[PDB]
């Protein structure tokens, strides 16, 4: 009895944060539900890069004053993450934005020799999303819903 939704979510989010911080594309195999996970990561690559670029100044301003220096500070970021959803609203935009800010922070962690904090950051983000938004996620068919939400068709409809 292991948490398969957490595992899948963590794989997607951990890989994205790590690849954003380093520019390296992990050659490790995805594994169970690898198909959905691959498409989710690819989607996150397209849309997340846009969020970070579109809102670079906002993200920089936040990062600057949050003064993240080690794992203790990462732990503290969970508080902000909780409050993003404290109004009762969940949607994919907020989820991508949170993950995208995570990637932005991961980049920063890399620069200050705190790469060891990237995995705890990914775990924290995944924890909040999966543990506290599980019912909403399931109602979208999980990461399949994520892929579909951001899907842009090329149909001469």
């Amino acid at each position: 009895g292991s948490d398969e939704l957490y595992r899948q979510s963590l794989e997607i989010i951990s890989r994205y944060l790590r690849e954003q911080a380093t520019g390296a594309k992990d050659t490790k195999p995805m594994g169970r539900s690898g198909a959905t996970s691959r498409k989710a990561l690819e989607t996150l690559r397209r849309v997340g890069d846009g969020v970070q670029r579109n809102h670079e100044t906002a993200f920089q301003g936040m990062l600057r004053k949050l003064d993240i220096k080690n794992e203790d500070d990462v732990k503290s970021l969970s508080r902000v993450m909780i409050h993003v959803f404290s109004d009762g609203v969940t949607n994919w935009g907020r989820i991508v934005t949170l993950i995208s800010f995570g990637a932005f922070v991961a980049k920063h962690l890399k620069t200050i020799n705190q790469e060891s904090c990237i995995e705890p950051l990914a775990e924290s983000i995944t924890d909040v999303l999966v543990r506290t938004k599980r019912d909403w996620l399931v109602k979208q068919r999980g990461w399949d819903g994520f892929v579909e939400f951001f899907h842009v068709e090329d149909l001469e409809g």
Partner: peptide
């Protein structure tokens, strides 16, 4: 209120604005 709420608000705003690009 507490600073964390201000930061969350910024992310919520960005997220909701982004959601509206795709929601349909």
């Amino acid at each position: 209120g507490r600073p964390e709420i201000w930061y969350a608000q910024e992310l919520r705003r960005i997220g909701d604005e982004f959601n509206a690009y795709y929601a349909r």
